[PDB]
């Protein structure tokens, strides 16, 4: 029973963007534009069900070029949503259909919400080499796209999950970096080493699902879930670190992550969602970090045996990024480092007698080496089993004073706010049911005024704006109970309701005494 700003879309919502006081939703067959203040629908754009034909390419008049009778409508599920501000501000969207190509929508000055005025597909054929397609960006089987401007150009780091049927005719790249041409009419690969693929024999036996991707300390990181080796049937999570100099893939390394619960020790080896944030003072001194350091917060789950499907058993681990980099640079020796098993062959010339140069942490060479670690980076659960019997599916993080607070969403559709601390009871101070649908890991956190912002959370066809503070009060129904709230929530009794002083508009707000009746 919570009155919150929400919006329904009549189709599932994939990715979401916040930019210039407008909220951009990338939903199945549509792109919605809502006003940030009230989540009222302002603009629409129909990327709706589209007809596919081999002789038809993006931006073409397909109805005049080919025979379209009996065509099966294909639903265009959004896959990537990006906003560019380097040049003229625009919105790049990548869908699942039409070879996974992307399109851009340009914003006018007088009106910053015209997404249907100037739209250019980003596609250019390759008549010279008919097998190469740098504009085929996104796999419909799962893709994670991270864009960044560097050296006066726009770069697209893409992780794609590949089915074996793509490889024969329509192939994609497991990890790639594409540069947007200055004419904004196509991507390009600068070298043979701008992309790393899985061997054709391992397209089926070695799936790779890309969970997260971020940039930190002039490095690109990709959180993914793979098989531990090749002949094994168990799955685990790896973090992937690489450098990008002049749009290249240099110093590529994969390192396994392990989130254990010592209460012998069970491992939660499947990442469900992550979020990089800086810590509050308490947690910071609890994990040997500084206030300005980037921490990777991860929500893990335990795998059903010999599978990558997680059961309703979750955990939460913190990985300071500086400790990750130091683990890359120090643990390396003559036994932990390995060759990339799915990139090269298991029996390759490089996988036998080539070592990472010690002249190196980010150098670009003509013959780049791509490695894979044996020893994992382990951390203990910070909730210590509190969520060891549910499936967490969303996480974000903010700071209230010296406290680091985590926003969690579950498989059952529950939203909850908890305080993250190793020494202390990890008991959620906020806990309710957003929707019957699972909570999507794609979320937003926006800070306004003094640490009093909000977070956008997605469930099914609905997205809700949830305030970062004051929800712990709104479930108490008596002043004698409103007085017992934990001190950091700053609750008080407003005549008939329990809120914080900001939400008590008129009347009396008390936080000291309460006078019950007998």
């Amino acid at each position, epitope marked *: 029973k919570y009155q919150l700003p929400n919006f329904t879309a009549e189709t599932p919502i994939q990715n979401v963007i916040l930019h210039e006081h407008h909220i951009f939703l990338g939903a199945t067959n549509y792109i919605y534009v809502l006003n940030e203040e009230d989540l009222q629908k302002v603009a629409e754009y129909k990327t709706g069900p589209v007809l596919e*034909h*081999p*002789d*038809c*390419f*993006p*931006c*073409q*008049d397909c109805s*005049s*070029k*080919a*025979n379209l009778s009996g065509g099966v409508w294909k639903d265009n599920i959004n896959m990537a949503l990006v906003v560019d501000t380097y040049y003229d501000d625009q919105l790049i969207s990548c869908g699942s259909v039409n070879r996974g190509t992307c399109q851009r929508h340009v914003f006018p000055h007088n009106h910053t919400a015209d997404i249907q005025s100037e739209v*250019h*597909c980003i*596609f*250019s*054929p390759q*008549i*010279e080499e*008919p097998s190469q397609c740098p504009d085929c960006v996104v796999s419909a089987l799962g893709a994670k796209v991270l864009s960044s401007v560097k050296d006066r150009f726009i770069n697209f780091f893409v992780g794609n999950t590949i089915n074996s049927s793509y490889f024969p005719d329509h192939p994609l790249h497991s990890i790639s970096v594409r540069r947007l041409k200055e*004419t*904004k*009419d*196509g991507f390009m690969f600068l070298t043979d080493q701008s992309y790393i693929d899985v061997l054709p024999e391992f397209r089926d036996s070695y799936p790779i699902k890309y969970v997260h991707a971020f940039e930190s300390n002039n490095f690109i990181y990709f959180l993914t879930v793979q098989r531990e080796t090749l002949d094994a049937q168990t799955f685990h999570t790896r973090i992937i670190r690489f450098c990008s100099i002049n749009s290249g893939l240099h110093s590529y390394m994969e390192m396994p992550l392990e989130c254990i619960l010592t209460e012998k020790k069970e491992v939660f080896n499947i990442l469900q969602a992550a979020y990089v944030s800086k810590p509050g003072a308490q947690l910071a001194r609890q994990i040997g970090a500084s206030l300005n350091d980037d921490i990777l917060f991860g929500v893990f789950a335990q795998s059903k045996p010999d599978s990558a499907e997680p059961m309703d058993r979750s955990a939460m681990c913190a990985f300071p990024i500086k400790y990750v980099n130091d683990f890359f640079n120090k643990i390396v020796n003559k036994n932990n480092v390995r060759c990339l098993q799915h990139f090269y062959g298991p029996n390759h010339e490089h996988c036998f007698n080539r070592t990472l140069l010690r002249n190196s942490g980010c150098e670009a060479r003509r013959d780049e080496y791509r490695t894979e670690f044996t020893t994992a980076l382990q951390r203990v659960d910070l909730f210590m089993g509190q969520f060891s019997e549910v499936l967490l599916t969303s996480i974000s993080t903010f700071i209230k004073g010296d406290l680091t607070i985590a926003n969690l969403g579950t498989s059952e559709g529950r939203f909850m706010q908890v305080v993250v601390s190793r020494s202390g009871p990890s008991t959620p101070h906020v806990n309710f049911l957003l929707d019957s649908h699972p909570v999507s890991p794609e979320v937003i956190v926006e800070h306004t005024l003094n640490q009093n912002g909000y977070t956008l959370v997605i469930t099914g066809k609905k997205i809700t704006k949830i305030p970062l503070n004051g929800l712990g009060c709104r479930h108490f129904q008596s002043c004698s109970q409103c007085l017992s709230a934990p001190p950091f929530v700053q609750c008080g009794w407003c005549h008939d309701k329990c809120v914080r002083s900001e939400e008590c508009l008129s009347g009396t707000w008390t936080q000291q005494i309460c006078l019950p009746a007998h």
Partner: antibody
Amino acid sequence: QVQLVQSGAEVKKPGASVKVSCETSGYTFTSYGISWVRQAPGHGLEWMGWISAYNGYTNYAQKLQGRVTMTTDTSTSTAYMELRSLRSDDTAVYYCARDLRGTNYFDYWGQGTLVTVSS
Amino acid sequence: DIQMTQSPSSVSASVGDRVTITCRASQGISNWLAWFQHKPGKAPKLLIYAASSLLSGVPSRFSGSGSGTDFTLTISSLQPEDFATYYCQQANSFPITFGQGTRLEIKR
């Protein structure tokens, strides 16, 4: 060497028809489409039609009153064009070009044949 | 039908000059546009496809620009081998339509 080799020049009387051939070599034939483009003395290029050997799809210009008929032999990888009800307007040079399927980007051409229509 | 409009119809330049031919599309064709160089006695030579993508072997001095309905072909420093009749073609819809051409002539 990827080459398109058209037939010889031809002279026809008005009312009759003409059939021009275009033998291609150097690539998998079905993987590309064949378009036809003619040019009359004193005029520029004019698209006549496109044919896809894969699908058998054909599209002709409404300016030609449906007098055009394009065919394709895949086993020999040759294209054929037929223009019926010839008028003096149709005296021109006919070119046979290839494109990467639906791209309509004509990389390699034929040498072009001269077709002369006059009484 | 969708109409292409080249400009100018004919222009004369010396060796070492920049020459630009503009093409105007009736409807938005995105970047489905090609430029052709046509010399007497031979077939048209494809120079630039996808509005700005150069074919292998075409010199660097040829440059393509434009998107939607306005397009531009640019030769930075002309050379004798570059004087010909240039054509503007679309690749967006049927019927496929060309431009009226542009004659390039040496100035003496």
